[PDB]
């Protein structure tokens, strides 16, 4: 998934 960083993130 994509829990956060880089940028914009939901899941």
Same mark, same amino acid.
């Given at each position: /998934?994509?829990?956060?960083?880089?940028?914009?993130?939901? /899941?």
């Amino acid at each position: /998934c994509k829990f956060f960083x880089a940028t914009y993130t939901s /899941c």
